[PDB]
């Protein structure tokens, strides 16, 4: 198993873990802030997914310092994992194309 597919798999598993820990930590950070909506676990999980994908529905967001910090980690983990998959696909394409040429 080549490095890029291992990394892609590792990144995926890591992202799922970041999503779950982020849903938990967001609820713990946001309860106690008046007006916060990011305060039950199922919808926090939905929120951490829409944050990692940057899908931008705007139905849920953190209002506290630590929930925003948690949100930043989730954004970066999401954007980064997806970028890694692209890099892994590009390594595949570039290698399969060397072969098509002989090299």
């Amino acid at each position, epitope marked *: 198993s080549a490095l890029h597919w291992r990394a892609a798999g590792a990144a995926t598993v890591l992202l799922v873990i970041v999503l779950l820990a982020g849903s938990y930590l967001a609820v713990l950070a946001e*309860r*106690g802030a008046p007006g916060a*909506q990011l305060i039950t676990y199922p919808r926090a999980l939905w929120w951490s997914v829409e944050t990692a994908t940057t899908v931008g529905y705007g139905d849920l967001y953190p209002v506290t310092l630590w929930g925003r910090c948690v949100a930043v980690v989730v954004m970066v983990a999401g954007i980064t994992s997806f970028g890694l998959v692209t890099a892994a696909l590009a390594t595949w394409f570039v290698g399969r194309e060397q072969e098509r040429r002989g090299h």
Partner: antibody
Amino acid sequence: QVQLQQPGAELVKPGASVKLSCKASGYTFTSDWIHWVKQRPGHGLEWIGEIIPSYGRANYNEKIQKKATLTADKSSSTAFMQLSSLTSEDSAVYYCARERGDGYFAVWGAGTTVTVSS
Amino acid sequence: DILLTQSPAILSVSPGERVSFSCRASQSIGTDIHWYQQRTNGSPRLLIKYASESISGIPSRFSGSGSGTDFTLSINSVESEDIANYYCQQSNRWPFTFGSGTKLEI
């Protein structure tokens, strides 16, 4: 089973303090919150505060005079509410209830009748 | 903080009739409303969650409806054991809050 056990009654002299217990049973998860709710005779339900025992973080109703301090003993699955410097206004039934972090109170304790008197 | 208005405070109904408790939220809260029943000197009992979801152990007689600001708890066919105070509660926004309560009377 009885999932939340509370003492039936506490008598408190005005100015003094009392630590109410709430022993939990049944399924306990790291994600559970225990809430506390005050019911003065013949009146409605009043949310006091919440604790997550598997971390010890507690939040409070900031709209009322802060009388309460929430703690939890992971070892004994018991949540405590320390009510301090009480007056007749603090005489009530205090319920604890368990919430699975999904917004509602699935189970309550029988409640503790607190009486502030000499 | 989200205000939950329950009016009227008392509801007088005849046995077997349908009955509807109103719960109105000061702002839009989706379906994030739950309903408790409390009889004379008992603790509150979860009746309905998320505005319409059944709770195991609760008579099918009970149902809920609404979304946004206006929520209704309903009892097909009222009977004596339904005498109680009925409270709604929201989990949309911190802190959780309760409605002021509606007493059922037969």
